[PDB]
Design a binder for this molecule. Sequence first.
Ligand SMILES: *CCC(=O)Nc1ccc2ncnc(Nc3cccc(Br)c3)c2c1
Ligand SMILES: *CCC(=O)Nc1ccc2ncnc(Nc3cccc(Br)c3)c2c1
Lengths: 281, 291
Amino acid sequence: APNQALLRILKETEFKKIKVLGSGAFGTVYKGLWIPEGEKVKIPVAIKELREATSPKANKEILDEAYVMASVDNPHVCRLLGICLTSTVQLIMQLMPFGCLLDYVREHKDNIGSQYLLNWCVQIAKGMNYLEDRRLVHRDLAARNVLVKTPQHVKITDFGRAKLVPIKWMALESILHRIYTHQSDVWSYGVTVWELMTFGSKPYDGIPASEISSILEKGERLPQPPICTIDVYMIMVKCWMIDADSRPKFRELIIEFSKMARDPQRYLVIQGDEVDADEYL
Amino acid sequence: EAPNQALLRILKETEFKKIKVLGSGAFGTVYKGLWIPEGEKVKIPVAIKELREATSPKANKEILDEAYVMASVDNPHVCRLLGICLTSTVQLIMQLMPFGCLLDYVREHKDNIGSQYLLNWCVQIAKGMNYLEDRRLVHRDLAARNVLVKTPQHVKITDFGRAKLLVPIKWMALESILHRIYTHQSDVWSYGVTVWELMTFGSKPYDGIPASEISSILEKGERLPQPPICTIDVYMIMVKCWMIDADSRPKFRELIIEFSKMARDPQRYLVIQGDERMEEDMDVVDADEYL
Ligand SMILES: *CCC(=O)Nc1ccc2ncnc(Nc3cccc(Br)c3)c2c1
Ligand SMILES: *CCC(=O)Nc1ccc2ncnc(Nc3cccc(Br)c3)c2c1
């Protein structure tokens, strides 16, 4: 029907960049402070200035992404706050205090519980299902791209493609033919999960990126994280089937983990197991 | 309701090669090959199964459930799955058993097999099948060419293609032939023929009989005949397993016990009268040395 989600346009002077968050091949990120004009309030944010090259073809393109971060309302996907109109469009968004899901697990890894890990998997599967339900391919899904609002709430948030290269996290169809379907995302999901279960291991460490396409024919994949039971590692493997049709659908993944979420210690073995923008409104 | 921490190693194909073909089921085939972990100067003897050639997805979601199972059981009497491979058409790795199919071993060293050796295998198998019936599972396919020999002192079941929970007709119960109904008691019928197989050192059950008159033969009340080296005490247990009434058949728990009695005194139940027992480099450690 009508799709009335506001796009709010902010002027740059209202907010400044503090420290750099990460770098992508085209464009970068900052964590900064938004200070509405004369409102005595400093809102924590995240800003993305475009890849500096700015030619026009890319601008009609960067904007379609802003359209999207702006048009989805779901508990599991970040929601875009503002955008800026520099010559090279910038995008604004609420900052998530606990950082990338990838960082959070490295810093409080001695403390993460089995109950906590499954809840994140079930949540992400929902966030990805919402988009697959909305017919949309993320194409870039992986640990450094899910966020932590509170250890109890996570949200997907990079859309660099959001088409409606990260090879280690891409399906075989992708590497060889640049074919992304909803099921090509599932392959990424499978590696994203392996990421949590190692609290931050680099998938395929030290394997030159070019030998990767050949490794997968040869039939090798990522190994079994320690704290994983075989019931969990099996779902990771199924997502890596060379046949895109053999992979689980994001709808079914929500369900499978919801089962394990009921009984976390039966599937995960851990030693010693046991101002806000959002506020703004 | 205890967690399942069974490992599943994923291997890349280049790490191992197929040497000679082993056996065949029309969809799928075995192989005996050599697994060579990357640059670890070791050649491990293996067995590989490249599943049946088509990869209709429907079948892939199915082939993997089998791998889940060979992987999830720890018992001295069931082979245990080592690795799997991710070709498009899934493949499976497993520790090779040096003495081959239990069906082959008995043909090549038949003039030397002793009464004590034969009963020990029966009691062992009964345990291997009980372990599965105890974990709610039907092989559906059990027969001589599917038990293996680790050492003349240790045997293990190993083929699951069917692996169902809840066609080799000569080895199937009557419920199976007419209605495809496998229960744990319908494996018992197979067991009965598997044993008859040992007691003939490899005779083809129902030889020359066209497979289609087999369902009719069984209602006529005929069955497999008495292997010579069998006393009637042993052949009776074979017949009881062939009762048309699935409820009349012996349970795998009870079979373990019955043979354990005969295993105490092998010459009182088996008559052999030869009775008494007993260039290719080695780079090569069998399944155990490598974790
Ligand atoms: C791990 C470093 C990091 O990305 N941390 C972080 C914290 C909170 C966030 N809140 C909102 N956005 C992002 N990242 C980000 C990436 C791309 C585009 C946008 Br506007 C925001 C984070 C990231
Ligand atoms: C009698 C020929 C034969 O099957 N020999 C043989 C020796 C050792 C084995 N070790 C492991 N597996 C098998 N067979 C087999 C069949 C199906 C699937 C798998 Br991965 C292995 C044998 C067989």
